[PDB]
């Protein structure tokens, strides 16, 4: 009894049922066995897009702040608007108790990106 | 054909400048062909503009280079023949944005798109070589200092060195022409501009010359120990 064919089923099974507003794909495979996910998402809706997240998860206990903003500094200091957007996002994240990268993180990110227009 | 009325509508009004992304996505098929994006709008607008910085558009340029086709932007800012005009006002902003663009890293294209972008940035460096020529007179060194500084900056090792090597091993004539232009620029730079000037340019020239030399030159030293290998084998 072992997978031997793909990533943990629960994660892909749950994210596969998300909205079509998002788009998931894979980066260079640096999370082959343990991370099992390196996703890039681009919000496609009636709002301005932004830099995609990293989305690297941990085992199903999910104490995982999957995105870490590798390109935070320059890509977010490029413009003040998206900088304030990022600030609002970060302020909203900490209130989430035991957030879930699969649903909660992306949902809050989309909510903040859509509220960005104030 | 839609791009014409699109850019007309864009410049015609002072929009929120962030709702532009939404307006474009709505007005465009959102994935038909992104080769008709803002990539060429900047140049086709600045052509007629000439001696004008064309504000309110650099914001769009930034909101594009945030996440768009970096390759097209690169090739189009490379082939931009502004050295002849030498406005020193728009090309200044161009080099400024190119600095932060090339600072961190490029993106993946899952193809030889990376090599194409490398050839593009090589042509862009060739273009930058004319900065000292456009600043030789300077009767009406500011641009020269910044241009040579960005030249020195772009030479971060272990990041682009292999890419430049690949580019040089993919075509030679362009590289030989760039080297000849560098030699000519160094020769024309034989005037006593300043202490820092005409001195660091030679350093960048030697660095460019060493670019195709090798990537793993043996620079170790302080090996104070009699090697018994040769002794024993002999």
UniProtKB/Swiss-Prot annotation, chain A:
Assembly with partners or alone: Component of the Mediator complex, which is composed of MED1, MED4, MED6, MED7, MED8, MED9, MED10, MED11, MED12, MED13, MED13L, MED14, MED15, MED16, MED17, MED18, MED19, MED20, MED21, MED22, MED23, MED24, MED25, MED26, MED27, MED29, MED30, MED31, CCNC, CDK8 and CDC2L6/CDK11. The MED12, MED13, CCNC and CDK8 subunits form a distinct module termed the CDK8 module. Mediator containing the CDK8 module is less active than Mediator lacking this module in supporting transcriptional activation.
Modified how: Ubiquitinated by TRIM11, leading to proteasomal degradation.
Role summary: Component of the Mediator complex, a coactivator involved in the regulated transcription of nearly all RNA polymerase II-dependent genes. Mediator functions as a bridge to convey information from gene-specific regulatory proteins to the basal RNA polymerase II transcription machinery. Mediator is recruited to promoters by direct interactions with regulatory proteins and serves as a scaffold for the assembly of a functional preinitiation complex with RNA polymerase II and the general transcription factors. Required for cholesterol-dependent gene regulation.
Subcellular location: Cytoplasm; Nucleus
UniProt superkingdom: Eukaryota
Parent-protein start and end of this portion: 668 to 785 of 788
Family that this chain belongs to: Belongs to the Mediator complex subunit 15 family.
Lineage summary: Eukaryota, Metazoa, Chordata, Craniata, Vertebrata
Induction: By 12-O-tetradecanoylphorbol-13-acetate (TPA).
Tissue spec. comment: Expressed in all tissues examined, including heart, brain, lung, spleen, thymus, pancreas, blood leukocyte and placenta. However, the level of expression varied, with highest expression in the placenta and peripheral blood and lowest in the pancreas and kidney.
Protein name from the UniProt record: Mediator of RNA polymerase II transcription subunit 15
Swiss-Prot record, chain B:
Signal sequence annotation: none
The species this protein was found in: Homo sapiens (Human)
Protein name as it appears in the record: Mediator of RNA polymerase II transcription subunit 24
Compartments, as annotated in UniProt: Nucleus
Family assignment from sequence similarity: Belongs to the Mediator complex subunit 24 family.
Superkingdom of source: Eukaryota
Function: Component of the Mediator complex, a coactivator involved in the regulated transcription of nearly all RNA polymerase II-dependent genes. Mediator functions as a bridge to convey information from gene-specific regulatory proteins to the basal RNA polymerase II transcription machinery. Mediator is recruited to promoters by direct interactions with regulatory proteins and serves as a scaffold for the assembly of a functional preinitiation complex with RNA polymerase II and the general transcription factors.
Subunit-structure text: Component of the Mediator complex, which is composed of MED1, MED4, MED6, MED7, MED8, MED9, MED10, MED11, MED12, MED13, MED13L, MED14, MED15, MED16, MED17, MED18, MED19, MED20, MED21, MED22, MED23, MED24, MED25, MED26, MED27, MED29, MED30, MED31, CCNC, CDK8 and CDC2L6/CDK11. The MED12, MED13, CCNC and CDK8 subunits form a distinct module termed the CDK8 module. Mediator containing the CDK8 module is less active than Mediator lacking this module in supporting transcriptional activation.
Reported tissue expression: Ubiquitous. Abundant in skeletal muscle, heart and placenta.
Motif LXXLL motif 1 in this chain: 125-129
């Amino acid at each position: 009894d072992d997978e031997r064919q793909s990533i943990p089923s629960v994660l892909q099974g749950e994210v596969a049922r998300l909205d079509p507003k998002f788009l998931v794909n894979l980066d260079p495979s640096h999370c082959s066995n343990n991370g099992t996910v390196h996703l890039i998402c681009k919000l496609d809706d009636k709002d301005l897009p932004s830099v995609p997240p990293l989305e690297l998860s941990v085992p199903a206990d999910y104490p995982a702040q999957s995105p870490l903003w590798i390109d935070r500094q320059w890509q977010y200091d490029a413009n003040p608007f998206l900088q304030s957007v990022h600030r609002c996002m970060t302020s909203r994240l900490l209130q989430l108790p035991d957030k879930h990268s699969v649903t909660a993180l992306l949902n809050t990110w989309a909510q903040s990106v859509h509220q960005a227009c104030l | 054909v839609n791009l014409k009325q699109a850019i007309l509508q864009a410049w015609k009004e002072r929009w929120s400048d962030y709702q532009w992304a939404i307006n474009m996505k709505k007005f465009f098929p959102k994935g038909a062909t992104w080769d008709i994006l803002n990539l060429a709008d900047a140049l086709l607008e600045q052509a007629m503009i000439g001696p004008s910085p064309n504000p309110l558009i650099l914001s769009y340029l930034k909101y594009a280079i945030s996440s768009q086709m970096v390759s097209y932007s690169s090739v189009l800012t490379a082939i931009s023949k502004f050295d002849d005009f030498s406005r020193d006002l728009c090309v200044q902003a161009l080099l400024d944005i190119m600095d932060m663009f090339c600072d961190r890293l490029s993106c993946h294209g899952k193809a030889e798109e990376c090599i194409g972008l490398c050839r593009a940035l090589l042509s862009a460096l060739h273009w930058l070589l004319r900065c000292t020529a456009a600043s030789a007179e300077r009767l009406r060194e500011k641009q020269l200092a910044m241009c040579l500084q960005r030249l020195e900056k772009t030479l971060s090792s272990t990041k682009n060195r292999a890419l430049l090597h690949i580019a040089k091993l993919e075509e030679a004539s362009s590289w030989t022409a760039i080297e000849h232009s560098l030699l000519k620029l160094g020769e024309i730079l034989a005037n006593l501009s300043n202490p820092q000037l005409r001195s660091q340019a030679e350093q960048c020239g030697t660095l460019i010359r060493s670019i195709p030399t090798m990537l793993s030159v043996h620079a170790e030293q302080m090996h104070k120990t009699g090697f018994p290998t040769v002794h024993a084998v002999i």
